[PDB]
Structure 1
Amino acid sequence: MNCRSEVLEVSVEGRQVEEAMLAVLHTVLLHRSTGKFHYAAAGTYSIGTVGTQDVDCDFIDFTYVRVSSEELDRALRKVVGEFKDALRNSGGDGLGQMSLEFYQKKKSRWPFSDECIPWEVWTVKVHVVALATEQERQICREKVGEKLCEKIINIVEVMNRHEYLPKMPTQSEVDNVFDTGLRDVQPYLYKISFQITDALGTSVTTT
Structure 2
Amino acid sequence: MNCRSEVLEVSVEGRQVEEAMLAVLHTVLLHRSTGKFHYKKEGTYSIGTVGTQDVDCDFIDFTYVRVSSEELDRALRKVVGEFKDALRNSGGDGLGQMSLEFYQKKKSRWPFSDECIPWEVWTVKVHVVALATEQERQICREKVGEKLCEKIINIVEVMNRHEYLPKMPTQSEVDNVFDTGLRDVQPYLYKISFQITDALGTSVTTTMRR
Taking structure 1 as the reference length, the TM-score comes to: 0.93
Residues 1:185 and 1:202: Cα distance change in structure 2 (over 3 Å):
closer
Identity of aligned residues (%): 99
Deviation string for 1:108-150 (max 9, x for gaps)? 1234311110000100011011213221111110000001011
- Describe the SS at the equivalent of 1:132: coil
Report the count of equivalent residues.
207
Q: 2:130, 2:52 → 1: CA distance? A: 34
| 3-state secondary structure, aligned to 2:42 | coil
- Aligned 8 A contact 1:97 1:197 in 2: no
Q: Identify unmatched segments of 5+ residues in structure 1.
A: none
- Between 1:149-158 and 1:131-140, the stretch displaced more is 131-140
Structure 1 pair 122/203, CA: closer, same or farther in 2 (3 Å)?
closer
The answer to whether the 8 A contact 1:102-1:119 is kept is yes
RMSD: 5.5
* Compared CA separation, residues 54 and 88, structure 1 to 2 (3 A): same
Per the alignment, in what secondary structure is the counterpart of residue 16 of structure 1? helix
SS of residue paired to 1:142: helix
Deviations 1:153-185 (A, max 9, x none): 110110111011001111111100000000100
Change in CA separation of 1:140 and 1:47 when aligned onto 2, cut-off 3 Å: same
Change (3 A) 1:205 1:177: closer
Task: Report the CA distance shift for 1:180/1:24 in structure 2 as closer, same or farther (over 3 A).
Answer: same
2:55 touches 2:66 (CA, 8 Å); kept in 1?
Answer: yes
CA positional deviation for 1:90? 2.1
Where does structure 2 lack aligned partners over 5 or more consecutive residues?
none
Matches within 5 A, 1:82-93: 82-93=82-93
> Which deviations, in whole Å up to 9, do the C-alpha atoms of 1:79-119 show, x marking residues without a partner?
00110111133223310110000000002123431111000
CA distance in 2 between partners of 1:183 and 1:201 (Å): 39
Cα distance between partner residues in 2 of 1:117 and 1:68: 28
Structure 1 contact 61–145 (Cα < 8 Å) conserved: yes
Separation in 1 of the partners of 2:95 and 2:204? 22
Please, which moves more after superposition, 5-14 or 123-132?
Answer: 123-132
- Aligned-residue offset at 1:202: 20
Name the CA distance, whole Å, in 2 between partners of 1:199 and 1:35: 45
Q: In the TM superposition, what are the counterparts of 1:129-148 in structure 2 within 5 Å? A: 129-148=129-148
